[PDB]
């Protein structure tokens, strides 16, 4: 399984679903999953709540670069650099770090174990 291709494809599903139906975003994750976007919320239920607390509506993303390498235990770690615009607003730079774990049983199936988002402007 090729990390770059996995990573490009996840990236395309995730951001696309962020624009189209953020209420479904919770399905990329598993029971152990960590979400950070300020403590980290864990698991699907709390991630759905936190996703929905952010009120994403026609949220657009401009993806400038994706790095995706093999990680321990057949996983894939992904760093994404891009710009984000919620609800017709100004685009703001961010980075997002995902860790994608093979779902174990099923072939070519993965889930999001980690998701760490941070705006540049909230740091510099």
């Amino acid at each position: 399984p090729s990390p770059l291709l996995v990573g490009r494809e996840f990236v395309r599903q995730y951001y696309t679903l962020l624009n189209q139906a953020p209420d479904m975003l919770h399905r990329f994750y598993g029971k152990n999953s960590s979400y950070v976007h300020a403590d980290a919320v864990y698991g699907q239920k709390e991630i759905h709540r936190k996703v929905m607390s952010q009120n994403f509506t026609n949220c657009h993303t401009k993806i400038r670069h994706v790095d995706a390498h093999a990680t321990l235990n057949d996983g894939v770690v992904v760093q994404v650099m891009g710009l984000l615009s919620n609800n017709n607003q100004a685009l703001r730079r961010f980075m997002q770090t995902f860790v994608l774990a093979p779902e174990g049983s099923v072939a070519n199936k993965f889930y999001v174990h980690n998701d760490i988002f941070r705006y540049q402007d909230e740091v510099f």
């Binding site: 494809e9 395309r12 696309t16 994608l100 099923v106 070519n108 199936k109 993965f110 889930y111 999001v112």
Partner: peptide
């Protein structure tokens, strides 16, 4: 080889 992420309908990400 199409990759799956999470639990989804088949074809969730073959629509546009």
């Amino acid at each position: 080889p199409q990759y799956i992420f999470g639990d989804f309908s088949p074809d969730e990400f073959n629509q546009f």
